[PDB]
Design a protein around this ligand. Structure first.
Ligand SMILES: Cc1cc2nc3c(=O)[nH]c(=O)nc-3n(C[C@H](O)[C@H](O)[C@H](O)COP(=O)(O)O)c2cc1C
Ligand SMILES: Cc1cc2nc3c(=O)[nH]c(=O)nc-3n(C[C@H](O)[C@H](O)[C@H](O)COP(=O)(O)O)c2cc1C
Lengths: 257, 257, 257
C-alpha cells in the first residue's frame, strides 16, 4: 500500500495505539461531517469529479464546434510529524499513557484546514463554501425569544421551495451561551432537529438534512503512513484526498445576528 | 439515450442507410486509429483522465501542505448537417442510391479535426501531438536507397532503448510516390511491418506498435443523433468525446527528408 | 394519454427530474389539502358533480310539472411554461442541479390559484369558500392567554352541535409569531390537535377533522404534459380538474382577532 506502514519500526500493537488516538480526535473535530454526506471513497487514483457541463472554445462560424468538459480537481494534503521512539517502546513494558502530544496537535491543524474548505471554500481549488451563499441571509437579534422567531421564519422559506426534511442548527459556541435558556424550545421549533455548536463560524445557519444537497467527495479517507526514520524518532504523515460542493443552495439559510 | 434518435421522423430502415454511410468513411479517414490503441469507451459522463501527479500550491513553511491533482479534460465536439426529407423518402420506394452528399462532407471535416489533435495537438486542450517531440528527428534523403538507410538506422535507436515490437512507417502520400520502386525492400527492413500512407503529415515517422505507448481515450465513440426538424429537412449531428496522450516518447522517431 | 408525454424530446430519466421537482413543491404549498378530504379522481371526462336538488321551471297550473337537476361544474386549469433544452441535456452528462426556476415559479401560481377557490370561492364557478360562512365568527384578542380562551369557547360550540372529532387550527403565519409562547398549551386545548400556519388568510379558523364536511372533488389530479417545441426550448403545461364544496358548515368557526 502507498502508506508504507510495514516498513516502519513499530510493533503491530504500537500501530493501533496511534490509530485509536487519531480516530478519536477526528470524530469530534471534523464538524463539516456532521450534516454533510460523504460519497464513499473512490480510491487513491481518483483525480477529478465531473461537473456535468461543457465549456465552448470554438468560433461562431466554424463547422466543427468543440469545447472541454468541466470537472472539479481533488485536493491532496500531507501533514508530517515526529514521534520519539523510546517513549513508544515504553508501551511494550506495560505503560497505558504514552506521550502522543505531537500527534494530537497535528491532527487538529488538519481538521481545521478541512473545515475552511467547507465553510469558506478555496479560491485556487475552485470550491464555494457555505458562507459565501449570501443571498440566503436573514436578520436575528440577541434574546432567546428572537432566536425562536428566526427559526419559524426560516422554516417558511424552506417550505416555500419544497425543501422539507430534518432541520439542523449550526451555531457559534459563544453565541449559544446566551441561548442556553430555551434549549428545548429551540430543539422543537426545528421539529426534533439537532443543534451543532462549533467554533468555526461567528453567526449561525440552518440546513435541511434530507440528503443530497452538500456532498463531500472522498478519494482516500484520512490515513496515517510512514515517511522516514531520523536518529531516535520516526516521521509519519496524515494524508487525504477530498473535494466539496454544494448541490442545492436552497437547503441552506444564514442567520445574521 | 442522449442521442434523441427515436424522435426523428425517420424509418428504422432509413437510419441504417445513414449509419452505414458514416461508418464506411470513418473506417478509411481516421488515420490516427491505425497505429494507436483505444481504451474502451468510459461513457457519456466521463470528464477527465488522471495524469497521476500532484501540483503543490502551499508555502514552504506551512504545517499542512497541499496541492491539486492533475488530469486531462476530455474534448467534446458536435457537427451538424441537414438532410432533405423527400430524398430520404425515395429510399422506401426502392431506390438504392440516395443523395447523402451533406453527410459525407461533414464526416470528413470531423475526421480531419480529430487528426490535428493527434498529430499537432491542442494548445488549450493540453495535448501534445506526435509532431512536437522534435528531439527524436533524424535526417533522410531523396532516393529509395536512402530511405532504406534511414530505417536501418532508426531500428538501432529502438533496440538501444529496449523498444522491440512490430514497426510501422507513416509517410506522406506524395513522398511515397517516389519510393514506389522498393516497396518490398522497405516492408521487410521493417521486419514485416506496415506502411500507412496519409495526407496528414509532410515527412514520415516510424513507430513501434508493441502496445501501450500512444493511448486514445474514448468517452463516447462517434455517434449520430437528432437535433431539430426544419420545414422540409432534418438537422442531425455527429458527436464524440475523446483525448489523446503519448505515454512513451521513445517509441517514436521523426524522419526529416 | 391526453398528456402527450411520449412525444416530447425528453429522456425517460429527464422526465422524472421534472416530476420530482413539481411533486415536492405541491406537497408543501397546497394548504387546503391538509384538512379537507379528496374524493378520488373520477377521470378526464367527469364534468359535473350532483348537488341533489331539482330546480322547478313550470307553471303552477300545469299538468306535467318539470324542472332541471342542479350540479356543480368542474374547473379545468392549464398553465404553460418553457424549459431550455440545452440545460436539460446537462443532466445526462452527470449534473445533479439543473435550472428549473421556470417550473417552480409556475407551480406556485397554480397552488395559489387553487387556494383562492377553497378559501374565497369563485363567483362564476358557483363555489362558496370557507371565509364567506360569516355567521360562524367569534371574537379574539392579542395575547396568548386570550387565544386559549377563544379555543375553549369554540369547542363548546362544536359539542353543542354534536360535532366531535380531532380539531385543527388554521392560522395566519404572522399572527402565530405572537403566540409562539404557548405552543404546547394551545396544542392540548385542541385535545392533541394540529396547527397549520398558512400565508393564505389573515385571521384564524378552527375546523373539525372527523371526516366528510369539506370535500375536494378531483377529476384529474395535477399532471404535467407536453404542448410544443420552440427552437431551443420545450413548452409544457400543468393541468387539473377539480371543484370544492362545504357539506356541513357547522364543522367550521372563524376567529376575528
Ligand atoms: C536500559 C535502556 C533501555 C533502552 N530502551 C530503548 C527503547 O526501548 N527504544 C529506543 O529507541 N531506545 C532505547 N534505549 C536507548 C538506546 O539503547 C541507546 O543507548 C540511545 O538511543 C543512544 O545511546 P548513545 O549515548 O551511546 O548514543 C535504551 C537505553 C537503555 C540504557
Ligand atoms: C460542443 C457543443 C455541445 C452542444 N450540446 C447541446 C445539447 O446537448 N443540447 C442542445 O440543445 N444544444 C447543444 N448545442 C448547441 C447546438 O449548436 C444546437 O444545434 C443550437 O445551438 C441550439 O441553440 P442553443 O445554442 O441556444 O442551445 C451544443 C453546441 C456545441 C458547440
Amino acid at each position: 500500500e502507498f502508506l508504507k506502514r510495514s516498513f516502519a519500526p513499530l510493533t503491530e500493537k504500537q500501530w493501533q495505539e496511534i490509530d485509536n488516538r487519531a480516530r478519536e480526535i477526528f470524530k469530534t473535530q471534523l464538524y463539516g461531517r456532521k450534516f454533510v454526506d460523504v460519497e464513499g471513497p473512490y480510491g487513491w487514483e481518483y483525480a477529478a469529479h465531473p461537473l456535468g457541463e461543457v465549456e465552448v472554445l470554438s468560433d461562431e462560424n466554424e463547422v466543427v464546434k468543440w469545447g472541454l468538459r468541466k470537472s472539479l480537481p481533488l485536493i491532496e494534503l500531507r501533514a508530517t510529524f515526529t514521534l520519539d521512539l523510546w517513549e513508544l517502546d515504553n508501551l511494550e513494558r506495560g505503560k497505558p499513557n504514552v506521550d502522543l502530544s505531537s500527534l494530537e496537535e497535528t491532527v487538529r491543524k488538519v481538521a481545521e484546514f478541512e473545515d475552511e474548505v467547507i465553510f469558506r471554500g478555496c479560491e485556487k481549488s475552485g470550491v464555494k463554501g457555505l458562507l459565501s451563499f449570501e443571498e440566503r441571509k436573514i436578520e436575528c437579534g440577541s434574546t432567546p425569544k428572537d432566536l425562536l422567531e428566526a427559526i419559524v421564519r426560516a422554516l417558511s422559506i424552506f417550505s416555500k421551495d419544497g425543501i422539507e426534511g430534518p432541520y439542523t442548527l449550526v451555531i457559534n459556541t459563544d453565541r449559544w451561551i446566551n441561548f442556553l435558556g430555551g434549549e428545548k424550545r429551540v430543539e422543537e421549533c426545528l421539529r426534533g432537529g439537532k443543534i451543532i455548536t462549533t467554533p468555526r463560524i461567528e453567526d449561525a445557519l440552518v440546513v435541511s438534512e434530507r440528503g443530497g444537497d452538500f456532498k463531500l467527495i472522498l478519494g482516500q479517507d484520512l490515513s496515517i503512513g510512514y515517511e522516514d526514520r531520523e536518529k531516535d524518532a520516526v516521521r509519519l504523515f496524515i494524508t487525504e484526498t477530498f473535494t466539496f460542493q454544494v448541490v442545492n443552495p436552497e437547503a441552506l439559510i444564514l442567520l445574521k445576528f
